[PDB]
Amino acid sequence: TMAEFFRDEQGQDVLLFIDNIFRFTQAGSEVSTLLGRMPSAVGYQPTLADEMGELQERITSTRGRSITSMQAVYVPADDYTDPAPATTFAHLDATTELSRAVFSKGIFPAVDPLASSSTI
Amino acid sequence: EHWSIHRKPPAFSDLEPRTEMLETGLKVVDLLTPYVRGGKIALFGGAGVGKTVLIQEMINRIARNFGGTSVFAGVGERTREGNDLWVELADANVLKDTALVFGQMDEPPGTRMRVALSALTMAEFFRDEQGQDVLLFIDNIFRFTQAGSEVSTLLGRMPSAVGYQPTLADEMGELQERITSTRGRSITSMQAVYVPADDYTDPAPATTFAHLDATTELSRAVFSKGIFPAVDPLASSSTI
Amino acid sequence: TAGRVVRITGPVVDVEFPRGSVPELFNALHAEITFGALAKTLTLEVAQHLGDSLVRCISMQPTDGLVRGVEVTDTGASISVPVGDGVKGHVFNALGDCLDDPGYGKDFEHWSIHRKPPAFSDLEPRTEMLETGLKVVDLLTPYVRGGKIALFGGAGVGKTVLIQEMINRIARNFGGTSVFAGVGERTREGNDLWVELADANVLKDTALVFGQMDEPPGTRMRVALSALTMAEFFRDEQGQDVLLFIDNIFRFTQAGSEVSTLLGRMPSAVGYQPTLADEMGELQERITSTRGRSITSMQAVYVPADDYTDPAPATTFAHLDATTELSRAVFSKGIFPAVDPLASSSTILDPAIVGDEHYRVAQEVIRILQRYKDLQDIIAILGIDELSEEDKQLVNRARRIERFLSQNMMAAEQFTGQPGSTVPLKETIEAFDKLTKGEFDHLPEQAFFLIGGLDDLAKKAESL
Amino acid sequence: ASRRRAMKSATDNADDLIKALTLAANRERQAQITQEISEIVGGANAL
Amino acid sequence: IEGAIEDYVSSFREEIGTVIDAGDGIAHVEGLPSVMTQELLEFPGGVLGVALNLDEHSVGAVILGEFEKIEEGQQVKRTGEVLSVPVGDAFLGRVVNPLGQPIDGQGDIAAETRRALELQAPSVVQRQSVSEPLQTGIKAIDAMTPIGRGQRQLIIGDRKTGKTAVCVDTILNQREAWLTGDPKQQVRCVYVAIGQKGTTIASVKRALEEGGAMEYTTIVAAPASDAAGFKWLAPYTGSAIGQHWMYNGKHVLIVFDDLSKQADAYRAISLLLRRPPGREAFPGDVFYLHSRLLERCAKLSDELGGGSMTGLPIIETKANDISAFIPTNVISITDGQCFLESDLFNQGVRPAINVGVSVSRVGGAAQIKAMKEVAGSLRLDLSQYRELEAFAAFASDLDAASKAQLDRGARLVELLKQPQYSPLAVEEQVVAIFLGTQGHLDSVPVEDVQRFESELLEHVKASHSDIFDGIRETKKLSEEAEEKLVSVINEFKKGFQASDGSSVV
Amino acid sequence: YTGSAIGQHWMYNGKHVLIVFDDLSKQADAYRAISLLLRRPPGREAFPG
Amino acid sequence: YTGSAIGQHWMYNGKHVLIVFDDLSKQADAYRAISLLLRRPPGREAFPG
Ligand SMILES: Nc1ncnc2c1ncn2[C@@H]1O[C@H](COP(=O)(O)OP(=O)(O)OP(=O)(O)O)[C@@H](O)[C@H]1O
Ligand SMILES: Nc1ncnc2c1ncn2[C@@H]1O[C@H](COP(=O)(O)OP(=O)(O)OP(=O)(O)O)[C@@H](O)[C@H]1O
Ligand SMILES: Nc1ncnc2c1ncn2[C@@H]1O[C@H](COP(=O)(O)OP(=O)(O)O)[C@@H](O)[C@H]1O
Numbered sequence A: 001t002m003a004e005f006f007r008d009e010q011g012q013d014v015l016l017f018i019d020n021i022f023r024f025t026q027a028g029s030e031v032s033t034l035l036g037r038m039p040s041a042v043g044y045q046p047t048l049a050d051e052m053g054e055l056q057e058r059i060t061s062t063r064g065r066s067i068t069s070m071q072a073v074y075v076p077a078d079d080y081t082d083p084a085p086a087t088t089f090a091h092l093d094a095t096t097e098l099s100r101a102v103f104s105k106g107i108f109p110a111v112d113p114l115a116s117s118s119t120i
Numbered sequence B: 001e002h003w004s005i006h007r008k009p010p011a012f013s014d015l016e017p018r019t020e021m022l023e024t025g026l027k028v029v030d031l032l033t034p035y036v037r038g039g040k041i042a043l044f045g046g047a048g049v050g051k052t053v054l055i056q057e058m059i060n061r062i063a064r065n066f067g068g069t070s071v072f073a074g075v076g077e078r079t080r081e082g083n084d085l086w087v088e089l090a091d092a093n094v095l096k097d098t099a100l101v102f103g104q105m106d107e108p109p110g111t112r113m114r115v116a117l118s119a120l121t122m123a124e125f126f127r128d129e130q131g132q133d134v135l136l137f138i139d140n141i142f143r144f145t146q147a148g149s150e151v152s153t154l155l156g157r158m159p160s161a162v163g164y165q166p167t168l169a170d171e172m173g174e175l176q177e178r179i180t181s182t183r184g185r186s187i188t189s190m191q192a193v194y195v196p197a198d199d200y201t202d203p204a205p206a207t208t209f210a211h212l213d214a215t216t217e218l219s220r221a222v223f224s225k226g227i228f229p230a231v232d233p234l235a236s237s238s239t240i
Numbered sequence C: 001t002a003g004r005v006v007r008i009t010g011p012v013v014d015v016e017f018p019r020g021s022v023p024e025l026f027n028a029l030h031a032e033i034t035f036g037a038l039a040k041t042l043t044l045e046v047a048q049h050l051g052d053s054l055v056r057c058i059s060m061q062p063t064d065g066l067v068r069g070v071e072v073t074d075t076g077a078s079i080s081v082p083v084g085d086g087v088k089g090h091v092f093n094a095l096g097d098c099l100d101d102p103g104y105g106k107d108f109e110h111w112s113i114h115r116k117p118p119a120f121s122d123l124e125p126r127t128e129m130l131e132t133g134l135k136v137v138d139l140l141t142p143y144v145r146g147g148k149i150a151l152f153g154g155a156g157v158g159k160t161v162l163i164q165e166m167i168n169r170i171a172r173n174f175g176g177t178s179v180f181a182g183v184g185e186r187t188r189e190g191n192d193l194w195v196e197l198a199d200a201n202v203l204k205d206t207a208l209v210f211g212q213m214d215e216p217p218g219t220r221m222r223v224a225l226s227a228l229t230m231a232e233f234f235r236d237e238q239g240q241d242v243l244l245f246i247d248n249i250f251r252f253t254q255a256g257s258e259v260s261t262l263l264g265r266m267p268s269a270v271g272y273q274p275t276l277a278d279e280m281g282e283l284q285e286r287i288t289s290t291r292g293r294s295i296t297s298m299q300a301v302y303v304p305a306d307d308y309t310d311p312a313p314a315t316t317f318a319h320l321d322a323t324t325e326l327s328r329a330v331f332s333k334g335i336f337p338a339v340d341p342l343a344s345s346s347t348i349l350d351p352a353i354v355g356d357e358h359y360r361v362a363q364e365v366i367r368i369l370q371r372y373k374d375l376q377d378i379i380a381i382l383g384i385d386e387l388s389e390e391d392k393q394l395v396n397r398a399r400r401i402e403r404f405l406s407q408n409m410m411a412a413e414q415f416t417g418q419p420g421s422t423v424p425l426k427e428t429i430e431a432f433d434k435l436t437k438g439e440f441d442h443l444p445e446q447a448f449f450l451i452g453g454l455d456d457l458a459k460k461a462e463s464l
Numbered sequence D: 001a002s003r004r005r006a007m008k009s010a011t012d013n014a015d016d017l018i019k020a021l022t023l024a025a026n027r028e029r030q031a032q033i034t035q036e037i038s039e040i041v042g043g044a045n046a047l
Numbered sequence E: 001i002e003g004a005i006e007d008y009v010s011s012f013r014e015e016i017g018t019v020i021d022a023g024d025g026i027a028h029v030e031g032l033p034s035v036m037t038q039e040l041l042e043f044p045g046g047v048l049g050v051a052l053n054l055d056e057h058s059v060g061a062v063i064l065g066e067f068e069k070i071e072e073g074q075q076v077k078r079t080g081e082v083l084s085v086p087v088g089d090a091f092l093g094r095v096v097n098p099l100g101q102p103i104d105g106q107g108d109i110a111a112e113t114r115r116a117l118e119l120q121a122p123s124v125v126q127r128q129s130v131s132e133p134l135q136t137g138i139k140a141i142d143a144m145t146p147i148g149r150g151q152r153q154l155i156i157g158d159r160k161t162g163k164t165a166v167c168v169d170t171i172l173n174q175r176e177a178w179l180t181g182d183p184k185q186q187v188r189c190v191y192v193a194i195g196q197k198g199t200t201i202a203s204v205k206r207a208l209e210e211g212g213a214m215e216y217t218t219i220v221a222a223p224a225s226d227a228a229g230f231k232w233l234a235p236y237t238g239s240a241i242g243q244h245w246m247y248n249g250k251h252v253l254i255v256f257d258d259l260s261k262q263a264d265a266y267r268a269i270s271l272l273l274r275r276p277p278g279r280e281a282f283p284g285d286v287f288y289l290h291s292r293l294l295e296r297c298a299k300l301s302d303e304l305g306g307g308s309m310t311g312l313p314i315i316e317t318k319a320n321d322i323s324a325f326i327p328t329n330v331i332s333i334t335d336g337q338c339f340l341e342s343d344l345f346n347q348g349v350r351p352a353i354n355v356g357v358s359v360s361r362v363g364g365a366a367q368i369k370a371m372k373e374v375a376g377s378l379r380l381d382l383s384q385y386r387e388l389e390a391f392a393a394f395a396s397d398l399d400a401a402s403k404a405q406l407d408r409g410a411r412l413v414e415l416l417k418q419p420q421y422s423p424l425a426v427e428e429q430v431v432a433i434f435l436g437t438q439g440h441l442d443s444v445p446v447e448d449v450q451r452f453e454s455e456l457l458e459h460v461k462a463s464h465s466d467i468f469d470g471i472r473e474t475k476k477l478s479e480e481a482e483e484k485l486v487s488v489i490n491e492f493k494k495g496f497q498a499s500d501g502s503s504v505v
Numbered sequence F, G: 001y002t003g004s005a006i007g008q009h010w011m012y013n014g015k016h017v018l019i020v021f022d023d024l025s026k027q028a029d030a031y032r033a034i035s036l037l038l039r040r041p042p043g044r045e046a047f048p049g
């Protein structure tokens, strides 16, 4: 909200940084368990796509307003099949990935070249 | 005149095994798994293996040299396949000698529970009265098992481990027994069974095998090699 | 006072009582069956308080012909087991009635099967070293006093004979008596075991308790507790150390999971009871030694599908000290203990407890045997002739030590005629110290089979 | 003479891949069984 | 007011109940004040039912036979007591309903005495040890896993192996024993078929009467066309008739076709009865169920007549899996196994019995002295022979003893093969194994050993009969008999030629 | 469904029509969420039958 | 929790306290059992979220 206030009124390009978005989703699951809603696959919320979509689409660059973002996302238990990154894959344009094996090799910028992708 | 769909299984006291060497022209079936008249032979395989072509070639080769009546029933299949089959049979004069019935997938699952029963009713009416050799051909049997699973799920019955409806083997046995040749009448049944994801640990193919004696199955690796018959000789077997 | 049954679902039985006669958890209830052809009495135990003067219970015996409204009475006490000196002369199940005759009665004393572990303050702060008559186990896999040890094997590997030898050796050397508890044991095997024990003249000082599969899981879950109860009675009443035997633990866990899932609870952790560690701890906390008296236990666990990460084996391994393994290639070699020294270990083997020379000798033996096993490939493919002097001499020393490691037991006289002997640890360690140099490489092969000490073996070898 | 040792060492190294892949398959099948039983029970009790 | 309740309870022409709802093979009945568990209820239309679940205001039921006649408003009638089976001795050579009715075209059977299915098993103080030669008619079976009276043996196998043929041959092997006068060798064998196609049952029965063993056998068949009740209750009927015949001192042998179908029916009825499920959607008590049907068999003591029974349960598994729930439970509940791998039957050996995994608990206690002596521990010999083929598949140079051992192992393996529908007596098998162990056939070409031995045994049966008399009267092999056999085999092998062979000393 | 109906209208008129669906799993996910919200019984990994 | 509280009380004084947690997974299992006995729907691997 405050970022949007800076973008709209001031008419200035804005830098944005957010960290560990995954925890957000996790929180929702917990409260769902308390509301009594029917559980879904792997014990997640009955609905999760809509909230992720509305949170992602809220960030949008207008013709007169350019906004650059960069989000760090967590992966649980070193598994890529979970829905948490699976849904996030559809809302991204420039993506880089890390691996445990490459880090174990020794090089610190453990970025997989075969898995990283871009659209520009 | 009209007959009830539901019937009663024939008496056990009038059962006798049937042995006969009926021969076709194809090498694999002639040598590996010879067929038997009056018995059951089924086909197996996953998606897109080419069994429909095989059954079409089989019916084309056999119906010409046959003087009996044939009844074809399609539990689940695309409209295009049925229309093409109807056109092909119209292209020849054998269409008058047969009877056709089928149901499509777009219909609710309720209509997919009785088409096989209607075909069996027609077959038994022909066999018991006319006393003539008849041909009963079934495209598939997995579809009605699926529709039963979904209708049972909707009925509120507790499912089993795999998700199949309980007492599915009871329905299997009730359906399979209706095809039976007595001491005086002979009937031949052709069917092909679809397996899900080509997984043979699924209890449904295993329980549908128990009603079979002479079987021929298909594999995907030999198809990927380039061979069109795609018949696996190591696992295929007969009883004669 | 009297109570009436409400609903019956298999072995689960629901009962209703008047307001002022609600029982407490883990009590006993008696009922009768009217039908003549299936005349019987039923015993039930209280496990839940559903409320509104309603109690859910589990039948101890198979149910059939039960009629609604039948009156039920309360014992007023938990499960009672008989204790006294007249025990260990016969066999009987968890219910306590002797199978051979109902002659034994309520003359003996009666104790509740439910107890509590001893306090923390009076726990023994220091462990003790338990010595046996077999040299291989003392040298390689030392036994801890009051601990728990596992045994792996099958049929035809001489484990039953070893069990009998241990029973009689502990009976004769240090006194005391040992009780046997069979859970999930086949009836024919139980009868054969009884016949063998009777023919060995050691059945006099052993108490046999059996658990039949045909019984509902209640017996399968209470037989072990009853055996432990009577063992503790003997230990605290006579002052004699006792040895406790358990055939399997896997069936106990299966029975626990069964009785859990029958009560309509929620499954978890690969179809297992959620608090299995609680039952395991309650069972295993009453085996530790205290007050100068020791209670050693022997178990044989079964691994399902050759998996070691399964939760039940993982929980079982949390209370283990030593493991023993048996094979058939060692049997094909032709030695008595039939144990592989390389596949077994002990958690008390430390240089500061068993002496530095013992550890050095053990390391030397393990190294020699490992080198022999590694060079078996070259022995099979090319032989010993191509091997140099060092290789051939180490191979000869290894095979001689392997032949020497066998020791004659006592009951082996049933097929040989020679009773075994017990050797002190000092003599064995000094003999292994002198054999470390392999000075007896000139001895013939037949002379290396042990019968006892070293002087008698030397005399026999000189008598060949 | 140099040729023989290559095949010997090849066998020696080939054993461990068998061991490791068998372990991985065991873990995978155990996980699938436990997850399917968990999900079927979760579906059952909620109604 | 409590006196009013007491008088009302104590007040209780025939008792009548009312059906409230029905569907999917079960129904709900209320109004019955006092009933016993597993009562055999009666329905107005003639169909039968059993009571399994009891409630404060309802009684569960399971309908065995026809189900469509059930509707709301019908009146049930409490009848008799716990259901029983009428057992007798006229059941031989007939096929009966698992309920005890003559489904076959033959006329109605007589009745001797009614026995309730639910009975207590013999205790531990009424059993003896096992020592008796139950033959099998197959060389490898009694050559590796001996079978004795009172011993339960399991046969587990994959798809399409041939277990049915083995069971049929074992059943029909006792013709000579039946021909004997006294009933000491006489055994009354019975067969139980669960969930098999009627044509298969007819073919099996036809094979039985072609063998000529119809006199001393009966069949209890429950085809797939029946409901779950018959599939659940047939094995108990078979066990009841078997134990009744045993109680009089007659030796009987029970064979079960399958147990998976019974477990499936039990799971179906339990889930339809709305009972808590567990692992693999299986009820908790299923394991206990097996313990109630397989633990009946045991050797008896002489004080009770010394009766005997033997059971051969059959288990099928898919894709060569052993770690499944039911196979593990049944393996743990019994002793002795016979693995049937599909690969061995795929080519070569027809019996296709695995060697490195098969084991018998009783072992030598069930072995006749002569063939125990002649056995010579060829198990280890075959084990090392396999371990040596695993090495020397591409070998050109070997040790002389290694080559000789490999050749002997190959000859013995090629000898162990045996076709179907070919039962053999003990004497010819003992002669054959003596021939194999001594190495007299080592010079016979490996491609034609089997047929060769054939002629010899025929010639052995033709020109000589004293050896068989001796081996049947003393059950032991003598030195003079061995010398005569050596001379006979030498003179026979002197004049034999299959394909460019050579006669050697 | 809207796209299909729009296509069918020209289909009945005799004009050739081509249809492309961007994705199909999203529809299944939405239907599953709706069914789970409406207290319908679930199925194989929580999908309606 | 009691260990944490007794640590924090001395933390107020501003001194150095060392704390040992020799076992954690056992507490997780205890909480899992408590939750399941409270009929709360289990999450991944029977552990609540
Ligand atoms: N002899 C052949 N020569 C060439 N193509 C063949 C031959 N046999 C089969 N095919 C090909 O196989 C396909 C036939 O599909 P078919 O309907 O028979 O498969 P199916 O196994 O019944 O699968 P599904 O039920 O999934 O459609 C076609 O692509 C056809 O070209
Ligand atoms: N010794 C043998 N030599 C050659 N063929 C044999 C032999 N024994 C059995 N067979 C053949 O193997 C098959 C065995 O059929 P059978 O019905 O007994 O199978 P099964 O493995 O017991 O399984 P199922 O009960 O499912 O049919 C038959 O085709 C039979 O001819
Ligand atoms: N070291 C040995 N030397 C000779 N015979 C042995 C030895 N160990 C075991 N046996 C024999 O093996 C048989 C089986 O013994 P055991 O394994 O204790 O019983 P089970 O086979 O029932 O487990 C015994 O009869 C015994 O004679």
Ligand SMILES: [Mg+2]
Binding pocket: B049, B050, B051, B052, B053, B054
């Ligand atoms: Mg096709």
Ligand SMILES: [Mg+2]
Binding pocket: E160, E162, E163, E164, E165
């Ligand atoms: Mg068969």
